[PDB]
Amino acid sequence: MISLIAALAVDRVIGMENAMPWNLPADLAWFKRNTLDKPVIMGRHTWESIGRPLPGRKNIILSSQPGTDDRVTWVKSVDEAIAACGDVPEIMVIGGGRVYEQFLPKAQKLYLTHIDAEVEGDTHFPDYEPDDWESVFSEFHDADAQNSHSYCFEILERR
Template identity: 50%
Template sequence: MLISMIAAMANNRVIGRGNQMPWYLPADLKHFKQTTLGKPIVMGRKTYESIGRALPGRHNYVLTRDSHWQSDGVIAITALQQAIELEQLNETEELVIIGGGELYRLFLPFAQRLYLTFIDLNVGDADTFFPDYEPDQWQVSVESAHQADEHNPYNYRFVQFERR
């Protein structure tokens, strides 16, 4: 099974501030939905709480240290291996880690694919960052650049990387 990660980041690998994304980029939200729809997703508890609900059209796994934690529409797990084992039973081809920062750091060594959105934006007082993914270990398989427009206030690039 392919383990992948999807993230949007501003300059300097910023992905969050105060448990929120410090930008609104509709094109990236659409890209996220198109990329993850129909695939199982894994998120940390803080990410789940910032979203506030299970995302429809996907198996939602929430990784938490609290073995008693539960919420409607999600499967609580205490180890990524639990999600992998459950999805192998379903013959799932790809499992997508959607954040946050702690999950990205923990599982980057196991990821074979990255779906990254690079946003041309400087964010001050950031507290969450995407880990250094060592670009020499990755090969670009898909890339598209986009200019800011009336709906998307920043220049941005979608880049898909495959591990070498």
């Protein structure tokens, strides 16, 4: 099973100048709980954006060029990335926009954080067909002293 996990601001904006411009510790905890002990696939720009390996997860980086860090696994295609995960119950695709576009048709599950934030970005999550996905989990949260926006954690399953 292939899953995508992403935090979406308004208009499906997911990034700006290689950053995710919002401060939501509750999203980092959600991201951590849903990806720990599962292989994570990311594009080279997301690898550079995160800046270091994610502990407790096999890190697989997509790049058309050779790798530049042996603390992680480097791959040159979507099928090679999936193969490098091995026989596991769930693969987590963690970004960015270009990597999401390629794995979306292969994915069975979406873990989305809908953030009520206005962000002028340069990266978007794919324009997924709403008819093809069913909501199986939704939990809304109002902003608090630690999280500057209201946000909703949603899990979608391919119909």
